Amino acid sequence: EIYKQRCAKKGIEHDNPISRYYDRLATVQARGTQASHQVLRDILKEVQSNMVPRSMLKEWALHTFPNATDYWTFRKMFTIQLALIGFA
Amino acid sequence: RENWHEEVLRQLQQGLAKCYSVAFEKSGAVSDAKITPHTLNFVKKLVSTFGVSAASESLARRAQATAQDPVFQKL
Helix, strand or coil, rough: CHHHHHHHCCCCCCHHHHHHHHHHHHHHHHHCCCCHHHHHHHHHHHHHHHHCCCCCHHHHHHHHHHHHHHHHHHHHHHHHHHHHHCCC | CCHHHHHHHHHHHHHHHHHHHHHHHHHHHCCCCCCCCCCCCCHHHHHHCCCHHHHHHHHHHHHHHCCCCCHHHHC
16 A cells, blocks of 8 residues: 555655566567566566565655654564564 | 445455466466456455445445436446
């Protein structure tokens, strides 16, 4: 929902990176070859550069928690809860 | 319980998620991948049923009356 809000503000469709991934795979496969690990790396790098920057969640949090204490507390809680969730 | 618009929307989203799972399974063969019988049956069920104890009986009666909507018929 955070990602979709960022996309709606930017005006881009949220399923665009998946379409780009499959389009790039079709383009490489049309050349009669399987996609290497490097092709997948290039696709992910392209998605990161163009459509989904690394800072979407951070910029959302900075807007959502302008108070420094609230931002710190939220981030710390998020970190520990994610630690437990990933462990599980 | 949800109205028929929301039911059809939910089923479309579920089918899209299943299609994405199949697409990554068939990632080797994009532009040649075909739909599985499961997705075929899912879409057949969706088109056959397009969304549409006294409380449950009254809800069923309402749903029967809901099908008269011309906009729902055109959709």
